[PDB]
Write a protein that holds these residues in place. Structure first.
Motif, short mmCIF file in Angstrom:
data_model
loop_
_atom_site.label_atom_id
_atom_site.label_comp_id
_atom_site.label_asym_id
_atom_site.label_seq_id
_atom_site.Cartn_x
_atom_site.Cartn_y
_atom_site.Cartn_z
N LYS A 71 7.19 8.82 -10.45
CA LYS A 71 8.13 7.97 -11.20
C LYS A 71 7.45 6.74 -11.84
CE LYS A 71 11.59 4.63 -10.44
NZ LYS A 71 11.26 3.22 -10.13
N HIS A 72 6.67 6.00 -11.03
CA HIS A 72 5.97 4.79 -11.46
C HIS A 72 4.77 5.12 -12.35
CE1 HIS A 72 8.45 1.85 -9.24
NE2 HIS A 72 8.22 2.46 -8.05
N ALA A 73 4.18 6.29 -12.12
CA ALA A 73 3.04 6.68 -12.96
C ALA A 73 3.52 6.95 -14.37
CB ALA A 73 2.30 7.91 -12.39
N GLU B 53 0.20 -2.69 -9.77
CA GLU B 53 0.37 -3.17 -8.39
C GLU B 53 1.50 -2.44 -7.64
OE1 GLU B 53 1.26 -7.58 -8.70
OE2 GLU B 53 -0.20 -7.63 -10.40
N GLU B 54 2.62 -2.14 -8.34
CA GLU B 54 3.70 -1.35 -7.74
C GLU B 54 3.18 0.06 -7.47
OE1 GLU B 54 6.81 -2.02 -6.62
OE2 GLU B 54 7.31 0.05 -6.16
N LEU B 55 2.44 0.59 -8.46
CA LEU B 55 1.82 1.91 -8.29
C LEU B 55 0.76 1.91 -7.18
CD1 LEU B 55 2.05 4.68 -9.80
CD2 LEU B 55 0.05 3.97 -11.15
N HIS B 56 0.01 0.83 -7.03
CA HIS B 56 -0.95 0.63 -5.97
C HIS B 56 -0.25 0.78 -4.62
CE1 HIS B 56 -3.91 -2.51 -3.82
NE2 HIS B 56 -4.05 -1.23 -3.34
N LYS B 57 0.94 0.15 -4.48
CA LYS B 57 1.72 0.22 -3.23
C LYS B 57 2.04 1.69 -2.98
CE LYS B 57 6.00 0.25 -3.32
NZ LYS B 57 6.84 -0.96 -3.34
N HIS B 58 2.56 2.36 -4.00
CA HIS B 58 2.91 3.78 -3.87
C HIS B 58 1.71 4.69 -3.55
CE1 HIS B 58 7.21 3.69 -4.38
NE2 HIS B 58 7.06 2.75 -5.34
N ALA B 59 0.56 4.41 -4.16
CA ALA B 59 -0.63 5.18 -3.82
C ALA B 59 -0.99 5.05 -2.34
CB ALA B 59 -1.82 4.69 -4.61
NI NI Z 1 8.66 1.82 -6.18
#
Ligand code: NI
Lengths: 85, 85
Positions: A71-73, B53-59
Motif C-alpha cells: 500500500k505505502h510502496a 520513513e512510514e515505508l521504513h516502519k513497514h519494511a
Molecule cells: Ni502504515
C-alpha cells in the motif's frame, strides 16, 4: 529532472516491484500452510496440529504485513511520479 | 513415518524453504528502503521523506514477520522430523 530525482523515482519503482513479488509469495505460503493444516488434522496429530494452527496465524500476519507495505510502496511511487515522472 | 506422515513432513520442509526465501527478500527490501531514505533526505523532500520513513516502519514490520514465520516454520519442521523423519 535532476539525476538524483530520476534516481529516486527509479528506486521507488523498484521497491514497488519487489513489494508486489513478496506479497504474491506470502499468498502462496499461506496456501501451503492451509494445505499442511488440512493434512495434519486428518492424521490425528493433535500436538502437530496445534503448532500448525499457530503457524497459520503467523502466515496470516506475514501476508498482512506484505499487503500493508505494498500500500505505502504504491503511495511512494505515486508521489515520486507526480513530482518527477 | 507412514506415507501420509512422510508427506506432511515434506510439506513442512517446503514451507520452511519458502519462509527462508521470503525472509531473504524482506532483508533486501529493507536495504532498498534505507538507501532511498538516504537519498530522499539528501534531496530535502520532506513529504517524500515522510512517506519513505512510514515505508521504513513497514519494511521492519515485514522483515520481523518473515523472521517470526521462519522461526515457527523451522520449529514445526523439526518436530515433524522428530516424529516421522
Ligand atoms: Ni502504515
Amino acid at each position: 529532472g535532476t539525476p538524483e530525482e530520476k534516481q529516486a523515482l527509479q528506486m521507488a519503482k523498484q521497491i514497488k516491484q519487489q513489494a508486489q513479488e513478496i506479497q504474491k509469495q506470502t499468498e502462496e505460503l499461506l496456501k501451503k500452510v492451509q494445505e499442511l493444516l488440512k493434512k495434519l488434522h486428518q492424521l490425528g496429530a493433535p500436538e502437530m496440529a496445534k503448532i500448525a494452527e499457530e503457524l497459520h496465524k503467523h502466515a496470516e500476519a506475514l501476508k498482512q504485513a506484505a499487503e500493508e507495505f505494498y500500500k505505502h510502496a504504491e503511495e511512494l511511487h505515486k508521489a515520486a511520479e507526480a513530482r518527477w515522472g
